[PDB]
């Protein structure tokens, strides 16, 4: 039987390491005209938007390729006791498949 540590060790999020500029694949699960809600595994989702190039291809369910610029988007501001999260990943669209 497995532990937890062992499991963590041989899991894709730990295999990769830092998320800065890593071409990752992930599915889109929700749509509001311009924006696309993309799940790429990980903690949060992210949003990019429909490009001009094949806009009618990016539908609910399809796979897309993200560049990934951090996993969480956080920052601490002048008077903040804790950093204020957005609950989004920030990941740029390359294309499809």
């Amino acid at each position: 039987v497995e532990s937890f540590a062992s499991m963590l060790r041989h899991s894709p999020l730990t295999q990769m390491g830092p998320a800065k500029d890593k071409l990752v694949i992930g599915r889109i699960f929700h749509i509001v005209e311009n924006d696309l809600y993309i799940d790429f595994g990980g903690k949060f989702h992210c949003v990019c938007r429909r490009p001009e190039v094949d806009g009618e291809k990016y539908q609910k369910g399809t796979r897309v390729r993200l560049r990934l610029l951090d996993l969480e988007l956080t920052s601490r501001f002048l008077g903040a006791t804790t950093d204020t999260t957005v609950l989004e990943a920030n990941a740029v669209l390359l294309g499809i498949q």
Partner: peptide, 27 residues
Amino acid sequence: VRSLFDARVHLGHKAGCRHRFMEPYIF
């Protein structure tokens, strides 16, 4: 535990956003 792992229960927020009273539970 495997199921939990699969479901991504094990993930948390960024270490700056960690609240003091969840430190015993964090790995």
